[PDB]
Amino acid sequence: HDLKPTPGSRKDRKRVGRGPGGTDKTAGRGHKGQKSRSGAGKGAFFEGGRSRLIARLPKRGFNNVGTTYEVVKLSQLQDLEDTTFDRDTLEAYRLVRRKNRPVKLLASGEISRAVTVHVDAASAAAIKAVEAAGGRVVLPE
Amino acid sequence: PRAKTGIVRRRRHKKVLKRAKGFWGSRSKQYRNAFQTLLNAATYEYRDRRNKKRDFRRLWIQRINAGARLHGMNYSTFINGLKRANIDLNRKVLADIAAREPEAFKALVDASRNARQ
Amino acid sequence: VSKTGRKMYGQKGTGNARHGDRSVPTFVGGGVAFGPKPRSYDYTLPRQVRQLGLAMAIASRQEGGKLVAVDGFDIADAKTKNFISWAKQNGLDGTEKVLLVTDDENTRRAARNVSWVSVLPVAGVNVYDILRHDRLVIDAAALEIVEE
Amino acid sequence: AKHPVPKKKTSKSKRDMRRSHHALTAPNLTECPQCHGKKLSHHICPNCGYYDGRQVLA
RNA sequence: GGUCAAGAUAGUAAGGGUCCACGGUGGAUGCCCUGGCGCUGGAGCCGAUGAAGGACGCGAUUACCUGCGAAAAGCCCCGACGAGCUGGAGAUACGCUUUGACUCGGGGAUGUCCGAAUGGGGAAACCCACCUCGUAAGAGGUAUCCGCAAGGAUGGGAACUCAGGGAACUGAAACAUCUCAGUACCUGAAGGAGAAGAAAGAGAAUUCGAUUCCGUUAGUAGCGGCGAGCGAACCCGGAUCAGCCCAAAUUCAACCCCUCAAGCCGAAGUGGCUGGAAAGCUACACCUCAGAAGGUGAGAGUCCUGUAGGCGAACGAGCGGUUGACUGUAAGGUCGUUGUUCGUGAAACGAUGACUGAAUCCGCGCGGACCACCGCGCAAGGCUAAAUACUCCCAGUGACCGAUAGCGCAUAGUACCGUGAGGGAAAGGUGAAAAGAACCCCGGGAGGGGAGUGAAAGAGAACCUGAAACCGUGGACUUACAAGCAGUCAUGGCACCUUAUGCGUGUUAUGGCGUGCCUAUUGAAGCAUGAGCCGGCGACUUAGACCUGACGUGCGAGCUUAAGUUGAAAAACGGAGGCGGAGCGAAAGCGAGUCCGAAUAGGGCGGCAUUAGUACGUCGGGCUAGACUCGAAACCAGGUGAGCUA
RNA sequence: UUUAGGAGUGAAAAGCUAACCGAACCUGGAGAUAGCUAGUUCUCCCCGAAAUGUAUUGAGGUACAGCCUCGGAUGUUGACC
């Protein structure tokens, strides 16, 4: 044993790809002027560009408070073979069950099948879809 | 962390001190006139075995010029006599050989001399 | 880190003072400013790959010895002697490394060395010990290969 | 007040050819009038104490 | 052979140089039990029956230290355990033994000048009155504050909360609102816990109770020379999801799960070699819940201290459990402004400068001024331990250093710098062990001989190995009549031949000529500058969902924080949560399509001859920070002498 | 022996506070910060420049674009004749 080898138990298993690069440490290799010593590189803190211009000029438009923007349920793979797991309570897979801020409707049209939903919505988007798919009316707030 | 290279940077200086040849005073274990004189031995040293042809070029242009003038000779305005045989081509080194047998231009004179008409 | 006085000699006189207190990694006897602060190691490691990544450590490690058992039956209580010596009915007393798991904590602590075997049990699985002992042998009749 | 400082030095190379224009005159010339051998540059023993006649003392 | 002759040109080179051998005060690597950094878990000061720490104090000497100063290496007791000798000039000696010399665990005591010390003086080691005592000598003591007539308290503190507390270099590329912030400093408090903490409350669907921290949001709203910039509440975890206070419980003790040093045992065989007994070559058993570091000349389970098994009193705390001596239920407001995220103005809310002490109960405090309606809380004073945030000490623990490295201290912050508070070194190492050494020499001696010591004295009684500019000598070779810091080759030239093989090793008159490196430079080769050398330090990185992006992978419907349980790894459990997501629009809201208005014609979008992705890591630039370091005179808080000129 | 720091002394010089005071020293606030400027460490394979213009209380300061490397791309559109 130990005559003409080097290992004795794998771990030596390399890999089939990589991940790191070359890295840098800033101010290196014993050379390079590199970048501009004048303020930059160290600290700076304010951005590495001009300043606060062309920001000014506009008369500014308020109204940015949270209020409401809604999302969507995409409407495409829900009113087909989908039966029961989409009420306004159990539907919490893509942040739906999160109450308070409405979810409106927004669906297409035509519709060749139907489903059932604990809706709580009456948008004017999915007007071409609000019965065709199926599921009452019931306005809430 | 840590390293402490207060001993490893010895063989470094020496791995280049290989050229501690006969320089001056004691430029073989100097530590000044070493890693500098080495930078001095760092010039056309790179091309000091090719460019030298120019130096030994200063040989056959004194011999090949007009050795045995007892013939005719010209060298310069005679090279058109060289490449006037069947398959001349070759030239020097054969000049270095010309330093041996003097009969390298006996029946190799007027065998190119008037090899025009 | 030094914490000392301020002010200095003639910063601009005599022989290029370059003084003004001591705030550089020059003067021998201090620090270097900026570097290794304690650190607490902040990584999470995906929680998915674990109950299978282990299975992948059984890719070609399948050859590794594995089976089903309960401490020892051909013995009585506990006293570790001919109990471990039982591990001779297969050449397991100086030929490999032996993996250990079990579910007992009353007789599973009597083999701590520097180069020999390891031992820490919690009755579950651990990547920390999946190549350590060449023949992976869990087996407990209580917390065996259960995906649980 | 300082007059042009040292700057350039003169270690080896030179500082060699400086032990020859003086050195020591090298001697070993004479070896006393008659007995033993001291004498100096024309000057009596302390041995027999003499250049040729009575002088000095053992 | 010879008379003459030049031509040819030969050695020495006082001294030196190309090359080797023998070398220094200095000295790093390999390397060393204490000496440094980050830490878990506990513990967490005494207090006129007076503390931190210094000064001058004992052994036949005492000076840097142990204890203690005169009852100065220590005493009552119980007790460990031991029977021998009390710390560095380990001190020779002197002296004590096996029913208590020798070291000591805890409850006490002689306790010198200063510290609060305070009789007075009052510049630490030093001088006085006045009363009790008394063989003529000398013994008992003298200072302020609060129930006041004693007494009780105030001392010095390295990091934890506030409060009186308050600038400032910087940034905005300068530049008074500002960022630093309430930060440096001053002063007051107690426990090692105080600080907010049970309310005229947060939220908002027509809910929810006691503070704080971090987890996630929100890094949103706002703020704002409208500039950098600071930055809650809406939904979240646990430690905790516990009661009562001004006018109709605590104190000594028996028992105790239980901690604190002296301390008790604690495992299991050896021979032979190169050699220092080899734990390396080899051989077999025994010990096993206990097989981490380490000493004895070569890494040892059978030499030994830990680890698993468990014990210990006299004194006391310490986290205590049933109970004995006690009795456990009596102000909004105006004007000027500080804060709060809010630089103060388009806004209630803490409170102050002078003015108003109203309401007074279906009356009263506000939802960010006010109107209307709801929501909740009611003058009036505090306690609330638990976690959050701290780090003087006692075990144990870490991919650090290595005694100009690491705190300056691996026994020094010696001496001191000195005008003053205030600034300080440099420095380690002989082998296991000194056995650090009788015996004839030059010499004053230092230093050197013999020869043991020494396994090994090219360790060597200022001591490992021991590279180097400078520095010590000789030698094989060349050289003063030859010119350039230097160069490389080039024929020769003396030497050598670790392989006759007309082939090379150590080299030089001389030839082509040929000007250094760093490195802020259009620019040189410069006299443009930096450079005598040796040994090290030698910097854009470190934490930050700060972000974008290559590759490998996770998923296509995707990926997780806070610590709660496990706990020498973990981990699943976990939708707080944000990013991707149709969009556009000031937004509203709209809508798979969209702001225009009188609207087939147009820019963006779901769209789309369409990735809808995302997380970890090293990594392109950048970012919140001095965080590439350093070199400036100048602004400040505090404190120190004015014996310098006055 | 009190005066002291932004005050005193003073024969006025803008002299001195302890060998420099255009406002003492020392411990402390931040390293004054720095486009100034010295430097920013072992050895490399293939490619490659601006002092031109616009901006500036802006100039050897800095921003960007033509100007370099790389991932993807441009199925006929290149420059010469």
Added chain:
RNA sequence: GUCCGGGAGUGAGGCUGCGAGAGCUAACUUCCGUAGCCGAGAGGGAAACAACCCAGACCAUCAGCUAAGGUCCCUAAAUGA
């Protein structure tokens, strides 16, 4: 022919040709653009010497020819017509 991006540089040059501007058409003075050159590479010619005539390289061979430059010498090459 054909854009999106991680990241530059350091803004202050010189000269011959091409022509003017301030100008005794004077100035490696100064402004401009246009080829080259040196800021990022060596030589022959040029006495050696950034843009001038010829020429820009993979390391090694005391192998050949072209252009400039030369055909008397110090160091090449016909005082050939």
Added chain:
RNA sequence: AAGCGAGUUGUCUGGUAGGGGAGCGUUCAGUCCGCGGAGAAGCCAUACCGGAAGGAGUGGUGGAGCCGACUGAAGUGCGGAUGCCGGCAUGAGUAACGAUAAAAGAAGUGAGAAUCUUCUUCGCCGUAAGGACAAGGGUUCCUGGGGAAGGGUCGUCCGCCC
């Protein structure tokens, strides 16, 4: 099972801020069967190979360990920052021994003595460079004793050191 090219043609240019890219090795860590007493690691030198950096052949000496491949981490590497300390330096043996206010010698001693000591001769101050009190140093003064070092010669003199 991590991708690799001869056969060949142009490019393989030289490259300053830069892009894609390889490594020599030391310290920390993995696996240590290990490598070392014929003694490795510390170091001094010999023409094998390598893209350079470097890896190689052996003794020398030295004394107890030390690195390896697959791997990640680390204050990973200029002689060169007019830096800083520690040591060697050279200005170089010259300028200088101090206020230019004379000294010779007999003799004691012993290691030789010119500057000690017993002493006859000389001269400088003597309102001094006298003695006491003031501040200061604290160990000066002595019985005296030894050169390691100091008194900028040194010395058998100190008020060095006991």
Added chain:
RNA sequence: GGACUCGGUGAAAUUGAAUUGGCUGUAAAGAUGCGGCCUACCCGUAGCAGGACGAAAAGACCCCGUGGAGCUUUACUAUA
């Protein structure tokens, strides 16, 4: 009395490195290692200044620097 015979002690400011003669020329034109030419037997010490762009603090005269401090004026303005 120092410069020279002899005994001992001998440092600092500074500095890449000396086979360290010159011309005239050339070069960011103030060249000794560059060009082309001429020239010296090498070394030691006394002495002298033309010499290294003599030394020292990176001109502090000046300018550049969105540097500081200091004083004054009704400079913008705080303020006892």
